[PDB]
């Protein structure tokens, strides 16, 4: 008991340039207790402290890992601090590389033409992203998208289509109404998971 327990586990949860570190709290922690976040860059044996004390269970490590998509990844660790005592470090189990970045889209605006609707998939352009590092730049090729379409006056069902461009079209057979769209991105060569986009409908009428 002369020791302070360590965080059960530390793991990254990231989107394109939204690299957030997470960790579970120590069993029954006081409010005076905080976590210290450290950072290691693979290939260099040197741990750095990003935050000496954070009263949270998450920490946006973006700023200190902006050169991730041009590296071999990192390693993070967290230990609890209370008074003058602290815990052993709890390090992420895997190496945080570009393989743990959940793919997502910037947005998807739509247009009503004729027997179809066409959509453009605006890719994510986070402010923290240094201009040289655009999505199309990092994932230069094999970018694909899953399209879920939903007729608004209707039930909660979806038609699934698969496109290999940031641009697509949907046949508006005849019927009017409204069409809600959502996309999920991937890169055919990578096995990264993706998050479905926010609904995005358009008043055909």
């Amino acid at each position: 008991g002369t020791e302070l327990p360590s965080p059960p586990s530390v793991w990254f949860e990231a989107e394109f340039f939204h690299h957030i570190l997470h960790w579970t709290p120590i069993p029954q922690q006081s409010e005076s207790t905080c976590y210290e976040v450290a950072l290691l860059r693979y290939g260099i044996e040197s741990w750095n402290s990003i935050s000496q004390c954070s009263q949270t269970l998450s920490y946006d490590l973006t700023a200190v890992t902006l050169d991730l998509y041009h590296s071999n990844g990192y390693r993070a660790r967290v230990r609890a601090v209370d008074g003058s005592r602290h815990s052993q470090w709890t390090v992420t189990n895997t190496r945080f590389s570009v393989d743990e970045v959940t793919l997502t889209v910037g947005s998807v605006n739509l247009e009503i033409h004729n027997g179809f609707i066409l959509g453009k998939i605006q890719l994510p352009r986070p402010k923290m992203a240094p201009a040289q590092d655009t999505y199309e730049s990092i994932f230069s090729h094999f970018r694909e998208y899953e399209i879920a379409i939903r007729k608004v006056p209707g039930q909660f069902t979806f038609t699934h289509k698969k496109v290999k461009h940031e641009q697509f079209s949907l046949l508006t057979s005849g019927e009017v109404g409204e069409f809600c769209v959502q996309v999920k991105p991937s890169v055919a060569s990578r096995s990264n998971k993706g998050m479905w986009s926010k609904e995005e409908c358009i008043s055909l009428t």
Binding site: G43, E45, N93, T94, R95, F142, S189, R190
Partner: protein, 150 residues
Amino acid sequence: SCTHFPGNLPNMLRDLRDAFSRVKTFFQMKDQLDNLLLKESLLEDFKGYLGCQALSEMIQFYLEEVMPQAENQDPDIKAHVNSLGENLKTLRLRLRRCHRFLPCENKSKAVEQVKNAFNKLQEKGIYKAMSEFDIFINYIEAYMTMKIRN
């Protein structure tokens, strides 16, 4: 066969990564050193004109030294690791069978037929191959001039 490579590879790399993540945590939790082994130098060799030979050697390195000695140590993942190996060989195959991706592993057509033609002679072939050594030297000397001149 080979559709002189349009794009069937993407999925093969994905299969490879997918095959890896099933052993990722294991080895990454297990490896507590933070120095880089596959130095970027390897990448520069890959991006070098010896590249092909670099890629064949590394692939051989994993299938012959690393993966074999790993499943050796801890037979738990011995399955998942071997599967990544089959998954790696399926990759190599599709590579040395198309769009100049692994020429440094391909037998030569001519050299095969010429070997067949020889073997089909025997005593006679041992003599005709040697009495043509001058032509040989000539072809080599031709191959060379394709470098010291246009």
